[PDB]
Design a protein around this ligand. Structure first.
Ligand SMILES: OC[C@H]1O[C@H](O[C@H]2[C@H](O)[C@@H](O)[C@@H](O)O[C@@H]2CO)[C@H](O)[C@@H](O)[C@@H]1O
Ligand SMILES: OC[C@H]1O[C@H](O[C@H]2[C@H](O)[C@@H](O)[C@H](O)O[C@@H]2CO)[C@H](O)[C@@H](O)[C@@H]1O
Length: 490
C-alpha cells in the first residue's frame, strides 16, 4: 500500500508564542492558524519550550502553566507535537525576531564567572548557551549544567504527564547548543559574522582551555597551545595559517586539537541524552537532536566552517557518522536542519555544497540504522524548495510494491507565519504536504505507515570513544535521484 511511503510533515510555531513573561499571548489567533494547518493535512507542529521563561525566578522555580494552555490548544486542534527542550537564547541568530535569554539567575552567576560562556580567542563571551566546559562543574548553586538540564526535563515529564500519556507529544528535541543544535556558536551574527565567513573556534573559556592543556600534556606535548593562526569570523580559509594548504589543520598538533574539539561535542551530547533517556523512560515518545547544515566551504579540502563549528568532517574523515552512531545507543533521531538548498542557489565564491552534505549526513544515518529527520534552514515558499525537500525525503522515490528502501522519518517546516497562510503560498504548501504524504490523504494513525511509537526504552550500553570514531571511515553515499518522482509542480 502507498501509505508505507508516507513521510509526516510538521510546522514550527512562531517564536514567542509564549512571551518572556510566561504568558500565552494570543490563543484565539493561534487557534485559527492551527485549524488552517489541520485542514491542510499537516501532521503536527513543533515548539520551543524555553528554559529562560520557565525556570526564570530561580533554581527549580518552574511555571508550566502557559505551556499547559498551549499544549491543550494544540491537542484540541488535532495536531501532534514535537517539543524542544530549549536551553538556549533566542535573539542573536537568523530569524530570531524576539529576545529570550537564558534564566536571569544563571546570567547573574555569569557576572562573577564569565567563563561559563563560550569564548572566542579575542575574549568575547557569548551568552546564548553555557559552554560544554561547565557540563559537570557544580557551580550553579550546587548543581552542574547537566543536572540543571536533567531536572528541567524531569519536571516537564511529570507536569505534562497527561499530555504524554494521551499521545500528544511525538518526540522530544533535546537542545544541545546555539539555536538548540549540537555545535559550537562559530558563526555568531551578534559578533559580526557574515556568510560565508569561516567562523571562529570557541574553545577559549578557562575550563576548556585547562582541559586542552591537560590533554596535550598527557599526549607528550605540554607546549601545544590552542589555535592562534585560524584568522577571524569573516576570513576565507586561504588567508589563514590554520586552514591554508599544508596548514596547521593537517599537522599533528592541528589534528589533535580538532579531534579534542569535536570529541567534546560527542560527549556533551551523549551525556545529556543519557539524562533525557532517564527522564522520559517509559513514555511513548522518541528523542531527537539537531545537527546544523554548514554547507559553505564544503567543496574545499579544509571544510573550514564545519571544523570551527565542531564537525570534524574532511574528504577523508566522516565527522557526521560518529554522531549518528552515538545516537543509536539512545535510539534517537538525527534531525538535520538544512534540507531545502541546491548548490546552484549559492554564490560561487562560498564553495557551497548543501546537496552533497545532505547526501553524506542522511546516508551516514541510514548506514548506522538510525532514524533521520530534517528541516529547511531558511524560509522558502517556492516549488523548487519544496521539490528539493521531497527529493531528500525519499531519495529513490516511492515504491508501489511496499515501503521505499530509503525514507526520512519526518520533516519539520520553518515556520508558521502570515506569509505562509497567504492564499498563493498556502496553495503551494498544501501540494507539498500532499506529495510528502505520497498523494495519500492525511493519516491520523501513525501505525498505518509504520510509525507506531512504543514506550521509550533505557539507552543501550555506553559506546567507547574509539568505537564511535571508527565511524569516521569514509563511505560512498546512497544513490540519489536527479529529481523527485513526486513533484509539486502540477
Ligand atoms: O524554533 C526552533 C529554532 O529555530 C531557529 O533555529 C533554526 C535556524 O533558524 C535554522 O536555520 C536551522 O539552523 O535550524 C535551527 C533549529 O531549528 C531559532 O534560531 C532557534 O532559537 C529555535 O530554537
Ligand atoms: O546564519 C546562518 C545561515 O547563513 C546562511 O544564510 C544566509 C543566506 O545565505 C543569505 O543569502 C541571507 O542574506 O542571510 C542568511 C543568514 O545568514 C546560510 O546559507 C545558511 O545555511 C545558514 O543557516
Amino acid at each position: 500500500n502507498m501509505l508505507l511511503n508516507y513521510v509526516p510533515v510538521y510546522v514550527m510555531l512562531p517564536l514567542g508564542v509564549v512571551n518572556v513573561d510566561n504568558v500565552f499571548e494570543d490563543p484565539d489567533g493561534l487557534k485559527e492558524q492551527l485549524l488552517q494547518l489541520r485542514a491542510a493535512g499537516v501532521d503536527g507542529v513543533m515548539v520551543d519550550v524555553w528554559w529562560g521563561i520557565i525556570e526564570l525566578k530561580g533554581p527549580k522555580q518552574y511555571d508550566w502553566r502557559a505551556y499547559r494552555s498551549l499544549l491543550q490548544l494544540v491537542q484540541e486542534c488535532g495536531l501532534t507535537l514535537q517539543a524542544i527542550m530549549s536551553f538556549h537564547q533566542c535573539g542573536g541568530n537568523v530569524g530570531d525576531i524576539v529576545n529570550i535569554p537564558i534564566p536571569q539567575w544563571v546570567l547573574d552567576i555569569g557576572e562573577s564567572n564569565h567563563d561559563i560562556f563560550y569564548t572566542n580567542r579575542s575574549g568575547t563571551r557569548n551568552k546564548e548557551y553555557l559552554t560544554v566546559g561547565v557540563d559537570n562543574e557544580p557551580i550553579f548553586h550546587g548543581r552542574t549544567a547537566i543536572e540543571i538540564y536533567s531536572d528541567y526535563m524531569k519536571s516537564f515529564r511529570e507536569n505534562m504527564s497527561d499530555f504524554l500519556e494521551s499521545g500528544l507529544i511525538i518526540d522530544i528535541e533535546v537542545g544541545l547548543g546555539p539555536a538548540g543544535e549540537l555545535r559550537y556558536p562559530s558563526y555568531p551574527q551578534s559578533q559580526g559574522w557574515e556568510f560565508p565567513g569561516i567562523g571562529e573556534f570557541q574553545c577559549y573559556d578557562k575550563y576548556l582551555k585547562a582541559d586542552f592543556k591537560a590533554a596535550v600534556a598527557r599526549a607528550g606535548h605540554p607546549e601545544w597551545e590552542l589555535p592562534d593562526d585560524a584568522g577571524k569570523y569573516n576570513d576565507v580559509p586561504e588567508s589563514t595559517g590554520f586552514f591554508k594548504s599544508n596548514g596547521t589543520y593537517v599537522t599533528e598538533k592541528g589534528k589533535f586539537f580538532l579531534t579534542w574539539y569535536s570529541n567534546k561535542l560527542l560527549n556533551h551530547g551523549d551525556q545529556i541524552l543519557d539524562e533525557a533517556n532517564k527522564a522520559f523512560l517509559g513514555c511513548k515518545v522518541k528523542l531527537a537532536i539537531k545537527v546544523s547544515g554548514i554547507h559553505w566551504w564544503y567543496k574545499v579540502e579544509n571544510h573550514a566552517a564545519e571544523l570551527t563549528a565542531g564537525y570534524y568532517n574532511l574528504n577523508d574523515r566522516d565527522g557526521y557518522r560518529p554522531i549518528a552512531r552515538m545516537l543509536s545507543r539512545h535510539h534517537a533521531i538525527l534531525n538535520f536542519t538544512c534540507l531545502e538548498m541546491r548548490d546552484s542557489e549559492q554564490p560561487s565564491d562560498a564553495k557551497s555544497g548543501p546537496q552533497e552534505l545532505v547526501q553524506q549526513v542522511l546516508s551516514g544515518g541510514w548506514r548506522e540504522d538510525i532514524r533521520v529527520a530534517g528541516q529547511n534552514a531558511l524560509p522558502r515558499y517556492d516549488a523548487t524548495a519544496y521539490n528539493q525537500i521531497i527529493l531528500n525525503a525519499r531519495p529513490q522515490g516511492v515504491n508501489n510494491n511496499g515501503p521505499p528502501k530509503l525514507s526520512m522519518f519526518g520533516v519539520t517546516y520553518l515556520r508558521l507565519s502570515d506569509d505562509l497562510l497567504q492564499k498563493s503560498n498556502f496553495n503551494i504548501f498544501k501540494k507539498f504536504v500532499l506529495k510528502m504524504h505520497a498523494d495519500q490523504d492525511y493519516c491520523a494513525n501513525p501505525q498505518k505507515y509504520n510509525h507506531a511509537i512504543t514506550p521509550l526504552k533505557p539507552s543501550a550500553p555506553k559506546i567507547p570513544i574509539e568505537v564511535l570514531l571508527e565511524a569516521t571511515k569514509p563511505t560512498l553515499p546512497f544513490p540519489w535521484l536527479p529529481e523527485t518522482d513526486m513533484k509539486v509542480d502540477g
